[PDB]
Design a protein around this nucleic acid. Sequence first.
RNA 1: GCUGAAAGCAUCUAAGCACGAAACUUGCCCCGAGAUGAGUUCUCCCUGACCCUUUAAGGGUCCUGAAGGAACGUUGAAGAC
RNA 2: GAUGUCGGCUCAUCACAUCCUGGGGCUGAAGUAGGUCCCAAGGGUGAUGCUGUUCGCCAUUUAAAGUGGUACGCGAGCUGG
RNA 3: GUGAAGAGGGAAACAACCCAGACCGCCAGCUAAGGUCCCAAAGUCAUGGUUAAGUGGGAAACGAUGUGGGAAGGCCCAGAC
Lengths: 38, 142, 209, 176
Amino acid sequence: MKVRASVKKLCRNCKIVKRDGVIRVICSAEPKHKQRQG
Amino acid sequence: MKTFTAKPETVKRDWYVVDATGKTLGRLATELARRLRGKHKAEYTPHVDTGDYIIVLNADKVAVTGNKRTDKVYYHHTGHIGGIKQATFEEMIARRPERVIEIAVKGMLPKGPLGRAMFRKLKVYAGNEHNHAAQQPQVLDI
Amino acid sequence: MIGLVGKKVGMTRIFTEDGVSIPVTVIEVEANRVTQVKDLANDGYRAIQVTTGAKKANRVTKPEAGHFAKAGVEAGRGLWEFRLAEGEEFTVGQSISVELFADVKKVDVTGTSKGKGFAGTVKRWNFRTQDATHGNSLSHRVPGSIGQNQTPGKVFKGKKMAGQMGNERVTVQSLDVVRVDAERNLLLVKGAVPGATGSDLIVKPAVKA
Amino acid sequence: SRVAKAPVVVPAGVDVKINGQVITIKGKNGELTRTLNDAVEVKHADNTLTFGPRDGYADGWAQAGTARALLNSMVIGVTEGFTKKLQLVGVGYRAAVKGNVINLSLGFSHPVDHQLPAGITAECPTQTEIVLKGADKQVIGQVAADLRAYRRPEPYKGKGVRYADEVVRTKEAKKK
RNA sequence: GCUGAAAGCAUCUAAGCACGAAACUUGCCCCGAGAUGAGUUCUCCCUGACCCUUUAAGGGUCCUGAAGGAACGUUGAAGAC
RNA sequence: GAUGUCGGCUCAUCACAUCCUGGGGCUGAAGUAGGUCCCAAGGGUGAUGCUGUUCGCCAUUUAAAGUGGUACGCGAGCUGG
RNA sequence: GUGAAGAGGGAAACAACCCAGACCGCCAGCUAAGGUCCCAAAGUCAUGGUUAAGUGGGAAACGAUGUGGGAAGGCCCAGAC
């Protein structure tokens, strides 16, 4: 999990999802693409 | 002539019963407070208590809007250096159904001995059964 | 489960055949006589009120005497209450004896500790003493500082200070039951229990186990 | 919305019961029911169910789509139910079913016994296989997830409990 | 995490359903109805007159004093008092 | 027309930017170990040689030897190098 | 300009900010700044929008399918996504 103020897509498989008021990046190909904005 | 003033030994106080189910907390509390203070009477006098006795039923079913049911926090301090303690709305309803309405009305009443005397007239109950059938309360819709 | 009221007789040892000495406290548990049963309908909770021992007929007032007469029991030296669990029931006038603890093997003993009087902070709160020499002026056992400065501006509530010590109700938990002696009205528990010799003790099965 | 546009076809042998918001489905596999959201219009028709938003409800189409999906799963539920297949990978990893309880030996120092819910039945073809059957899609998925959580597939050999149709994507440690 | 649309797909979240830490709230122990919002149960004890008036939840007088409590004294592994 | 300075001592209380113990994601995470980030204050977090010393450096512990605020907390508490 | 050398209303309180300068008396009215659910006087006011975080009622570069609109585009029913 990467905790950043700037969360972005890092490859084609990474997706932006908003869960409970938090912008998150979940990526089905690369586990180290997980990100939450905090 | 002097302006009329109410006499504490001759004021007429009546009894009312209110069902709190589904009501918004604050919008019920303001009306409760204004009738406890007596501001609905033509004999209202700021230094004497002319309000009525109000019985509140189903205090546990009172409603709040938004996310207040889980986000409204009730702080108090015990007097010791650790001290600060808090409870959400849900926790208060689970433990003290009556306490929430009591403290809302208390916060809406004047502070001082007369305000405490006014708050003394409020009877809050968790269920829909009360012990004051002998005082014949009238049904009041809020 | 309920417990029983006894009195601290003293303290001794038990030698085991394998050469171990067990320090035990001897608690004399006479018959406990149920004087009142409290139920949910009338009293709002379930409990029994028991009495034990005996009292001089001249020292029992007609309020107390009438309360004892209603139960039909003899006067005891006091009254204690035990909260009842869901299972058990008792009847007024019933007597409960020490073999209640026949198969318990852990008890909780409650008593009034010995009164130490007005005690200083070193004794009461294990405060460290200051220097005995090296220039110390009149301050060998005093508490030292008690607060910070202007910013708090007051002494915080619950500060540790000198005062009354002991003579208060204390519970000791999870004591081994070494022996139950029904015919002698004796209960022997491993270790020390609060209170001086001859004081009242309340014995209950261990709550934590 | 446009998921909710497509009506769900009620086949033969299965019936529907509606009380405004709470709905009931009964078929050969059994009983299913739920209370739909207050913003969705359930409307039975000739052997079909049609769903639409109410009035004065924002995002009534999204709720309608959710309701359509849930009722579709119910209909597919009371007929031929659902099945989930679990696999056990790793030396000494075994599974066994004893009535209403699954016994798992996953390399722990203690036994693992899982209690199934009301509507789920389990059956182990081999000791490395757990087949689950039930009417409720959500419940069977939850049970499969719970079984999986005991020993998640670790990424160096894939050892652990996995869904039968799962990709593990192992990796090597450093080199050599 | 499960089911699941918006946004044929997907998606832990929006509806809905689960979990999850020495925090939290309890559970272990102590104090505690001046908890003026002063609560509760059992038991004990008192059911005589008369007069005067502003009359009021009035005041005296005589007879009576109960349950209990205090005082004093012998004292205490209680306690500055 | 006076708000005593540093260090030690005795006694502290709080914040969290948590040192230890607890939960978890990512790893260039095989295990043993870690790293990094997130949550979390319930409790615990050395005594000595030199120096007036805070500090520092040592020599041995430890689960760990947290960091700050509090008139650089504390002299109508003490010392006074 | 205001305090100094000015009161009063308002700003929670708050010389110097805002409105507005107090001859004295009145249990008269009418307004300004500020307000009109309640503490605490007066709108639980009418009509339309807009926000869901308690924004309101404290914060930046920088991130994000959070929503209310507008003006233009490409693609597409032969068939777009």
